[PDB]
Write an enzyme that holds these catalytic residues in place. Structure first.
Site, mmCIF file in Angstrom:
data_model
loop_
_atom_site.group_PDB
_atom_site.id
_atom_site.type_symbol
_atom_site.label_atom_id
_atom_site.label_comp_id
_atom_site.label_asym_id
_atom_site.label_seq_id
_atom_site.Cartn_x
_atom_site.Cartn_y
_atom_site.Cartn_z
ATOM 1 N N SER A 1 0.856 -1.110 0.113
ATOM 2 C CA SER A 1 0.043 -0.047 -0.141
ATOM 3 C C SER A 1 0.887 1.459 0.014
ATOM 4 O O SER A 1 1.589 1.337 -1.112
ATOM 5 C CB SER A 1 -0.789 -0.234 1.247
ATOM 6 O OG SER A 1 -2.178 0.783 0.940
ATOM 7 N N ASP B 1 0.076 -4.328 -3.693
ATOM 8 C CA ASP B 1 -1.096 -3.512 -3.699
ATOM 9 C C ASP B 1 -0.717 -1.969 -3.581
ATOM 10 O O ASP B 1 -1.316 -1.530 -2.669
ATOM 11 C CB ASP B 1 -2.257 -3.715 -3.018
ATOM 12 C CG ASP B 1 -3.604 -4.113 -3.614
ATOM 13 O OD1 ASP B 1 -3.593 -4.125 -4.818
ATOM 14 O OD2 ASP B 1 -4.599 -4.272 -2.721
ATOM 15 N N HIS C 1 -7.666 -5.521 -0.421
ATOM 16 C CA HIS C 1 -6.395 -4.749 0.096
ATOM 17 C C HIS C 1 -5.800 -5.220 1.309
ATOM 18 O O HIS C 1 -4.354 -5.457 1.218
ATOM 19 C CB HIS C 1 -6.777 -3.281 0.396
ATOM 20 C CG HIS C 1 -5.487 -2.517 0.307
ATOM 21 N ND1 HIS C 1 -4.521 -2.382 -0.612
ATOM 22 C CD2 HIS C 1 -5.281 -1.399 1.191
ATOM 23 C CE1 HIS C 1 -3.807 -1.513 -0.329
ATOM 24 N NE2 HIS C 1 -4.074 -0.692 0.651
HETATM 25 CL CL LIG Z 1 -10.179 -3.713 -0.949
#
Ligand SMILES: [Cl-]
Ligand SMILES: O=C(c1cccc(F)c1)N1CC=CC1
Ligand SMILES: [Cl-]
Ligand SMILES: [Mg+2]
Length: 371
Positions: free
Chosen positions: A219, A242, A297
Site C-alpha cells: 500500500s 497493492d 487490500h
Molecule cells: Cl479492498
C-alpha cells in the site's frame, strides 16, 4: 493463526532500534534461526499500538482497550530472540508497512521469507503514517525505558498531495538508513540496541549477502518501494504489494532502473492508481504485474488471519479467496522474482509461472480497464 513459513529454515525474530531518537532506525528483524524451542513472538507488543489502531479506525480510544483485550496476547510463529542460523550469507529484504500499520503487522510475509533463507528488516516509519510508534527523547530516557509515543496524523484535504509526498520521501530515507544500519552491523560495527533485548547483534557480522538486497512493501509501503528504488541503487529490485501510488512525485516514474513487480488485489485497484503503475513502464525496464483473484487490500497484512471468515469478510480483512491461499501465491511469486533479479541459487524458479499470473487464482496483469 498467522501461518508458519513454508520454507526449510526455522525462523527467529527480534527488534532493533538504533539510534534511540525519532530520527534513528526502528525495525523488526525476521531471520533463519539456529533453534526452534523459543517462545513465540508477541504480535502487537504494547498497549499504545491498540490506542493508535483505534484512532486510525476513527473510534474512541477505549475501543483501543477492547482491541487489546481481543488481540493483546496473540503471538506470531517466530522464535523470539533465537540465535541466527550460522554458516551462510543471507539475502536482505527491507519491508515497508502501509498507512495505519506498523513494523509487526506483516509477519506472515516476513516469517515466510525468513523460512526460505532471507533476513527481513520490517521498518517502523516515523513519518506519522504508522498508527503508533515510539522512540526516546534522549540517552537518559532510553536507559530507563521512558518511551515517547508518536501517533498517526490525520490530514485536511488541502494537505493531501504535499504531506503524502513528504511522508513517502521520509519513508524512502528510512529504508535506506535501515539498509546502512544492517550493512554496518554485517561489517562488525558495534551498535548498542536502544532496546534491552537478549539478542546479540554481533551474530549478524558476516551474515548478509551484501549484493542481494531488495525492498518490498504494501500500500503506502508499495509507493515506498518505488521512491526507495529511484533514490538508492543498493536496492537491486522491488516488489510493490497493492501499491497506493498517490504519494509519488511526478519525477519518480521515469527514474526506476531496477526490476519491479506489482502484486495487486482484485478489489482495491482503480484506474487512477493503475495509470500511475503503467507510468513506471519503459521497454528497457523489467516490469511484471499480477492480480490475485477474489482478494482485498488487507489480504497482504496479518489482520487477514486475526479473525474468522464471516467477521473477516465484513471488515474487509478477507476476500472471497482463502487467506492462506492468497498469501502463498503472493509469497511464492515474490520468491521466484527475487531469485531471478537477485541471482539466487535456490529452487524458487519452481514458481516462475506465477510471475506471469499463470494459476487459476491469478489474473495476468490487471482486471482494471484504463481509457
Ligand atoms: Cl479492498
Ligand atoms: O484495515 C485495517 C483494520 C484492522 C482491524 C480492523 C479493521 F476494521 C480494519 N487496518 C488497521 C491498520 C491498517 C489497516
Ligand atoms: Cl480512478
Ligand atoms: Mg540515496
Amino acid at each position: 493463526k498467522i501461518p508458519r513459513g513454508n520454507g526449510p529454515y526455522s525462523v527467529g525474530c527480534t527488534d532493533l532500534m538504533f539510534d534511540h531518537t525519532n530520527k534513528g532506525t526502528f525495525l523488526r528483524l525476521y531471520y533463519p534461526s539456529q533453534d526452534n524451542d523459543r517462545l513465540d513472538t508477541l504480535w502487537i507488543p504494547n498497549k499504545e499500538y491498540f490506542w493508535g489502531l483505534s484512532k486510525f479506525l476513527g473510534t474512541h480510544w477505549l475501543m483501543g482497550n477492547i482491541l487489546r483485550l481481543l488481540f493483546g496476547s496473540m503471538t506470531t510463529p517466530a522464535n523470539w530472540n533465537s540465535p541466527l542460523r550460522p554458516g551462510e550469507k543471507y539475502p536482505l529484504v527491507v519491508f515497508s508497512h502501509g498507512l495505519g500499520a506498523f513494523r509487526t503487522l506483516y509477519s506472515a510475509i516476513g516469517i515466510d521469507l525468513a523460512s526460505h533463507g532471507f533476513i527481513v528488516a520490517a521498518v517502523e516509519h516515523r513519518d506519522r503514517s504508522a498508527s503508533a510508534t515510539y522512540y526516546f527523547k534522549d540517552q537518559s530516557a532510553a536507559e530507563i525505558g521512558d518511551k515517547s509515543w508518536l501517533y498517526l496524523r490525520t490530514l485536511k484535504q488541502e494537505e493531501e498531495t504535499h504531506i503524502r509526498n513528504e511522508q513517502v520521501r521520509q519513508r524512502a530515507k528510512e529504508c535506506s538508513q535501515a539498509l546502512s544500519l544492517i550493512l554496518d552491523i554485517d561489517h562488525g560495527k558495534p551498535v548498542k540496541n536502544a532496546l534491552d533485548l537478549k539478542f546479540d547483534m554481533e551474530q549478524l557480522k558476516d551474515s548478509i549477502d551484501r549484493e542481494k538486497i531488495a525492498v518490498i512493501g504494501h500500500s503506502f509501503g508499495g509507493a515506498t518501494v518505488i521512491q526507495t528504488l529511484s533514490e538508492d541503487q543498493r536496492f537491486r529490485c522491488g516488489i510493490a504489494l497493492d501499491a497506493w501510488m498517490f504519494p509519488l512525485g511526478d519525477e519518480v516514474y521515469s527514474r526506476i532502473p531496477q526490476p519491479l513487480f506489482f502484486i495487486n488485489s482484485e478489489y482495491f485497484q482503480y484506474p487512477a492508481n493503475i495509470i500511475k503503475m503503467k507510468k513506471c513502464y519503459s521497454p528497457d525496464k523489467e516490469r511484471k504485474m499480477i492480480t490475485i483473484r477474489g482478494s482485498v487490500h488487507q489480504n497482504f497484512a496479518d489482520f487477514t488471519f486475526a479473525t474468522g471468515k464471516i467477521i473477516g469478510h465484513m471488515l474487509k480483512l478477507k476476500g472471497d479467496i482463502d487467506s492462506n491461499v492468497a498469501i502463498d501465491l503472493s509469497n511464492k511469486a515474490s520468491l521466484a522474482f527475487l531469485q531471478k533479479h537477485l541471482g539466487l541459487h535456490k529452487d524458487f524458479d519452481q514458481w516462475d509461472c506465477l510471475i506471469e499470473g499463470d494459476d487459476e487464482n491469478l489474473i495476468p496483469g490487471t482486471n482494471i480497464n484504463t481509457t
